[PDB]
Design a protein around this ligand. Structure first.
Ligand SMILES: Cc1cc2nc3c(=O)[nH]c(=O)nc-3n(C[C@H](O)[C@H](O)[C@H](O)COP(=O)(O)OP(=O)(O)OC[C@H]3O[C@@H](n4cnc5c(N)ncnc54)[C@H](O)[C@@H]3O)c2cc1C
Ligand SMILES: Cc1cc2nc3c(=O)[nH]c(=O)nc-3n(C[C@H](O)[C@H](O)[C@H](O)COP(=O)(O)OP(=O)(O)OC[C@H]3O[C@@H](n4cnc5c(N)ncnc54)[C@H](O)[C@@H]3O)c2cc1C
Ligand SMILES: c1ccc2[nH]ccc2c1
Ligand SMILES: c1ccc2[nH]ccc2c1
Lengths: 446, 445
């Protein structure tokens, strides 16, 4: 024999391969593995590129990640269950490591497992089609090294292409006339471009705060945040304004709902992403807004309309890397026959339950607990090692309390590994002054 | 019973529709037409949007066009033989009109034609595939208005998706560490953004020349061109430099081959585009660098491996809009069976002859005169109205002399139309001071 196509080699696609290898390393017969990645290296979001818009082959630039990015939450909340920070580094480090430091930690585990062989890099997925007679999928790809398009036959397909890469970009009145830059969070790369400039941040996602925060750090003159969705109510610095939603812009001025206006040099639209799958027709294609429980996914992973097709990591992400492992392990066992699937209507009833519960959620605390609960459910069914989920939630809660205390100093705080119990030290340099992005400057004493 | 798929509603797609409508107006029965267009409106490149990268539906932003873009060549060189400037504006207008004015003009023709009803907008072509058993093409699209993906069958397909939209974006050493803006020409929109800024223009194409001019016109402090090809031999302003090829950048500075160094605010890569067709497999896919004569295109339009698949406007462009018409009218008459196709073996040899001629071309005048000759060959076969192609060539030569004279005032020149003989009036404002982009400003006094 059986062949499995794996779509993308970010954390999810890496988790999937790692799952099969781990089973194989325990003495199990695994199917043939082929993983298509469109970039030249693995990492998905984590593989930083200066590029924006379209890449060197004309494929949409995937990564939304920017210079000076640090761990969004505590590292202790993403720590792998089968690979620790103590293992990888040998020395206890601070709670929010920068992009390069985390990437290296993600690379350590995946290189150790030796799954790089299975990946065909620089190869973009064009189309995935199911053949009712064959009961197998056809996968058409464009290899950019030889500039040829070829297709192979597989028994199962696992889609790990993400859903934070194809921006939702709304239009406001008069954008046509605006004299400054307009970009989505997805295009944002470098805070230095906005040095001594006034930036308007539109929308209220997690990135809105952090992109805004990076701009403040690197010498922005003014930041203005506006959104219609419920105000977050933080402790913003002296030069950071919070306004009601945007109605209009003109050549150099932004207009808001209260009737007020201001001069702005650049507009950043932190307005989210869409679930986009150009390689799939409607029979296989997941359509959903970003949320904790999308429909048509049995156990959050199995495409109900075709059980031999799988999605990894398509849920909104409070948890990340631990969720993808739990999912990949489950999917793995489903492919292998270790876990039988229920009837279609039974899968749907199960899904309906998960949704009915998702609709009840109001607080931040209910939401991670719910995702915690989901991951727990997946882990109970496989040989994947369990981990302290309630304590991981508690750490999440503590991190959200620090954000509300002070939005500029939350990255200086420290947390305890739930893998080892070792308390992370305080970093040598406070966040606001730690201008050097690098791993080398992170792993040392200056 | 015969059904045609037209991919794209830029000038080419507009031309293709118009060519069929023109046959119908004459009395002929025409096949069923369906046009797919991923944008919300027609005009292709000429449809301006503030957006860059990906569009509202997450499709790649197609238009490479920027604010304050005016016609690159004489409008007389791009006039429709069947729909003149005199007929559309009802009056004489200058020779180098702003994008909006030209866009209003190309929409004019198709509005009059009434061909809008064949187009399905906000629809992106996903895949085109030919069926051996059926001898038909299966065309799969994504309708972004309905969020549905569907397919329909067509007997012929005409690809008009363009080839100046998917960027060739080379990387340079230090790009990852450079503290300023790096964009491709494809993303350039507003030259005001670069006011009082030092801008590096990398590469040598026709937009390099213009993009730099817009940045100069709108108040850049300094501009640097760097390229690998032969000297352009243009007289640039005092704040405009020429350097050899870029080698590396650091955080603030750019470095060149000769050992020179310069502080730059923004790097705009005017490095070109690739023929990119994600919706086709290798059986149908056109593979080629940007040139006047690509292979596997009989009469430059008929795809030699599958004669029922056509390509419009896929050559490099000296002539533009009336070349598309000529291709479109030819491709129309082939579809309707007015023009029979020779052996696959005989098609190859005709294409290799045009190709061997292509390789002997050195001068600019040899390059457009080649293309003039190619159009002449096309229009001789169809009822597309004859027009003075040698006199068009002479207008290109004039334009070229005007560029060589002063690169910053060539747009102030005037030309006789080769359709109506109308002498284009000198514009109310010289280009360098004509800061207002709009049609309304361009048409007033
Ligand atoms: C701005 C930002 C900041 C973030 N910060 C954090 C953080 O601090 N901590 C945390 O835990 N998580 C963070 N995340 C969440 C992030 O989604 C996960 O960390 C993780 O990257 C998700 O992995 P994934 O494999 O599911 O998708 P992705 O990381 O997006 O990777 C998907 C992969 O699929 C590939 N692909 C897509 N389309 C194709 C195609 N057609 N053909 C071939 N390959 C394709 C891509 O190249 C990519 O490698 C952040 C996300 C964003 C957008
Ligand atoms: C920056 C720039 C400036 C230029 N200036 C001039 C000038 O001054 N004078 C001149 O004569 N020429 C100019 N050109 C040349 C230009 O190629 C022509 O003017 C003309 O626009 C080409 O027409 P076209 O229809 O063949 O391609 P396009 O104008 O690019 O039209 C292609 C159409 O196909 C659509 N499309 C693409 N893919 C899909 C898909 N997947 N599904 C559905 N629809 C799709 C696009 O949305 C678009 O509408 C310029 C080109 C550029 C890039
Ligand atoms: C979207 C944007 C930023 C993010 N950080 C962590 C998850 C995530 C999702
Ligand atoms: C690419 C860029 C600019 C251009 N002007 C005329 C043709 C053309 C092609």
């Amino acid at each position: 024999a059986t062949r499995i196509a794996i779509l993308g080699a970010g954390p999810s696609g890496m988790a999937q391969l790692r799952a099969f290898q781990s089973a194989q390393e325990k003495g199990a017969e695994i199917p043939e593995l082929v993983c298509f990645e469109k970039q030249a290296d693995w990492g998905g979001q984590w593989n930083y590129t200066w590029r924006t818009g379209l890449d060197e082959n004309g494929e949409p630039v995937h990564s939304s990640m920017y210079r000076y990015l640090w761990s969004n939450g505590p590292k202790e909340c993403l720590e792998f269950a089968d690979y620790t920070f103590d293992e990888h580094f040998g020395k206890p480090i601070a709670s929010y490591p920068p992009r390069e430091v985390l990437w290296d930690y993600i690379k350590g585990r995946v290189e150790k497992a030796g799954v790089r062989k299975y990946i065909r890099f620089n190869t973009a997925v064009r189309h995935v089609e199911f053949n009712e007679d064959s009961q197998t999928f056809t996968v058409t790809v464009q290899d950019h090294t030889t500039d040829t398009i070829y297709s192979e036959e597989f028994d199962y397909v696992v889609c790990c292409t993400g859903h934070f890469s194809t921006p939702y970009v709304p239009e406001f009145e008069g954008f046509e006339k605006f004299g400054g830059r307009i970009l989505h969070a997805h295009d944002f790369r470098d805070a230095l471009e906005f040095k001594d400039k006034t930036v308007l941040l539109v929308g209220s996602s997690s990135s809105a705060e952090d992109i805004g925060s990076q701009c403040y750090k690197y010498g922005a003159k003014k930041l203005i945040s506006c959104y219609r969705t419920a105000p977050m109510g933080y402790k913003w610095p002296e030069n950071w304004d919070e306004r009601p939603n945007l109605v209009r812009v003109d050549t150099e001025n932004a207009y808001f709902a209260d009737g007020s206006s201001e001069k702005v040099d650049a507009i950043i639209l932190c307005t989210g992403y869409i679930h986009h799958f150009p390689f799939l027709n409607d029979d296989l294609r997941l359509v959903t807004n970003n949320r904790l429980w999308p429909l048509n996914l049995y156990k959050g992973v199995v495409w109900e309309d075709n059980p031999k097709f799988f999605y990894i990591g398509m849920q909104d992400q409070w948890y990340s890397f631990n969720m993808f492992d739990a999912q990949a392990w489950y999917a793995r066992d489903v492919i292998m026959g270790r876990l039988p699937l229920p009837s279609k209507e039974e899968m749907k009833a199960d899904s309906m339950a998960w949704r009915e519960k998702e609709l009840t959620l109001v607080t931040a605390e209910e939401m991670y607990t719910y995702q915690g609960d989901y991951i727990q459910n997946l882990i109970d069914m496989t040989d994947y090692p369990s981990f302290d989920i309630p304590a991981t939630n508690k750490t999440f809660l503590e991190w959200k309390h620090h954000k509300k205390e002070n939005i500029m100093t939350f990255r200086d705080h420290s947390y305890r590994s739930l893998m080892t119990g070792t308390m992370a030290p305080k970093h040598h340099t406070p966040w606001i002054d730690a201008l050097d992005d690098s791993l080398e400057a992170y792993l040392s004493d200056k």
